[PDB]
Homo-oligomer: A and B are copies of this chain.
């Protein structure tokens, strides 16, 4: 008997205000110039 439930993953749990650069949750490869 296996029961897997209620796992929770959050990248940004609160406000992201007045951003002027780069906000990225998950980046695979890719280039960011900020």
Residues of chain A at the chain B interface (Cβ within 8 Å): 1-34
Count this chain's copies in the assembly: 10
Pick from B8, B9, B12, B21: contact of A12, CB below 8 A: B12
List B contacts of A9 (CB < 8 A).
8-10, 28-29
- Report yes or no: B27 in contact with A28, Cβ–Cβ below 8 A: yes
Pick from B18, B26, B31: contact of A32, CB below 8 A: B31
Can you name 20 extra interface pairs (CB under 8 A) apart from A24-B25, A27-B30, A30-B32?
A2-B2, A2-B3, A2-B4, A7-B31, A8-B10, A10-B11, A10-B13, A11-B26, A12-B13, A12-B16, A14-B16, A19-B21, A22-B22, A22-B34, A23-B23, A24-B24, A27-B27, A28-B28, A28-B30, A34-B34
